[PDB]
Design a protein around this ligand. Structure first.
Ligand SMILES: Cc1ccc(O)c(C(=O)O)c1
Ligand SMILES: Cc1ccc(O)c(C(=O)O)c1
Lengths: 263, 264
């Protein structure tokens, strides 16, 4: 991995591994989600971070609010995938990290992703608008002209996800995170939520369709000792509405939509 | 990754990733277990495989019977780890795949592993002895002189694991595999068993000790729609445990093992 010539984005090549591919011999969306996280961490480290000097002193962290992924073609085991990432400012709302997935040989675009991040106090789990003195430290690493992975005026990533009404058509109950589902700071990482959402997709859809789009709205963080229920309903290409909630009280932690295409 | 000069072993370098490290900012044993699997798959592909032409004709596959891993130092996020693997013949019992983990910079040995594989009919799940026709096909890829990752006069990889008596000191109930826990053929990955075994280690031991040795004896394969119970008991500076994985309902054994932890 390395910073581009202008230092305003990062490129990294990954060779797809045997344990990273699924039932159809191509990479899983959870492996892709890990590769986006990895390329994002190396971009943050190549610029000197992923928090800034002042936001470290204030006990401030960046948390994901939304994730949108679109895959046209999944790389096969042994294929080389080049990913390009970059940050941008969204005024006082937060930051946006974008990604482009390309084929190393053909040079074609095989996928793209976008995510919205919000700023919160590490301890009180509050939420606050981006302060100006914080923006001045990280804006020198973002391109000044807007660079959108999903440019198109009203595309797919910025649509409001509704709440799944009961009874759900499909469900997967009693989901618990293991120690491998936790990050270096013992927090359940945002890739596990994608896996948990897909656990309630019927096996017949898995065997006849391929995942093309996935939008996830993060509402609350799941804890190490928490139990989650995964709910899904066909809203239609096959489309679904998903809901992750705490097994007991039914407190919402995530809501999303997936779109599948016929193989 | 590439075959060595003599084509009798394979070397591959891995750069440790952010999501691959644990609470100690060093790689997890499940990430290491994945790297051993990956280097083994590329070694099998570099020689033309990991079934032979006779094994494919007879519906025969290789299944793990035992796994032994010993880690002296876990690589940190960003560190480069070079792994060297090779397979050997164990007469008509089966095959043995060995691994050496080294530091790319210092050149030192930071870990090693050994595994025993048995032959089994893929459909009937019936194990069988290694025939000579099959043995003739893969022995041209194994060194002729014995090359043991754990040579020593009486190594800890070949010790008999007993069955955990009830009540267990610690337990983790209701463990189910997800779709990411399954391989390309929809079979529960052998790495998931390691994670499931460690799910019953007390959190206090995790925060004060580091995993050094892990021996696992594979008895039965867990299915996609199965539920597992993880049981552990301290058998002991160093803390030792006896583990048992069994089906939540009937209590049918699928795995048994031992772990050794050292003070941080
Ligand atoms: C729905 C789903 C979730 C996780 C997976 O690994 C797969 C697959 O391998 O095709 C499918
Ligand atoms: C006992 C245990 C099991 C799985 C893990 O991933 C770790 C860790 O992250 O430190 C520890």
């Amino acid at each position: 991995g390395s910073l581009t010539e202008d230092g305003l984005s990062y490129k990294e090549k990954f060779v797809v591994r045997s344990y990273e591919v699924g039932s159809n011999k191509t990479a899983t969306v959870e492996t892709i989600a890990n590769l986006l996280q990895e390329v994002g961490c190396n971009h943050a480290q190549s610029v000197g971070f992923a928090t800034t000097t002042t936001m470290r002193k204030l006990h401030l962290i960046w948390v994901t609010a939304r994730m949108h992924i679109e895959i046209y073609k999944y790389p096969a085991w042994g294929d080389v995938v080049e990913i390009e990432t970059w940050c941008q400012s969204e005024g006082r709302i937060g930051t946006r990290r974008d990604w482009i997935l390309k084929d190393s040989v053909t040079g074609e675009v095989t996928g793209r992703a976008t995510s919205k991040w919000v700023m919160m106090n590490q301890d009180t789990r509050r939420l606050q608008k981006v302060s100006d003195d914080v923006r001045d430290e990280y804006l020198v690493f973002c391109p000044q002209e807007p660079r959108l992975a999903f440019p198109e005026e009203n595309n797919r990533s910025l649509k409001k996800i509704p709440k799944l009404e009961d009874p759900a058509q499909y469900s997967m109950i009693g989901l618990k995170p293991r120690r491998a589902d936790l990050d270096m700071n013992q927090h359940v990482n945002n890739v596990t939520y994608i896996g948990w959402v897909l656990e309630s997709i019927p096996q017949e859809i898995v065997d006849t369709h391929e995942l093309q789009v996935i939008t996830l709205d993060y509402r609350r963080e799941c804890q190490q000792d928490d139990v989650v229920d995964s709910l899904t309903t066909t809203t239609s290409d096959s489309q679904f509405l998903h809901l992750l909630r705490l097994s007991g009280d039914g407190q919402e932690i995530n809501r999303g939509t997936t779109l599948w295409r016929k193989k």
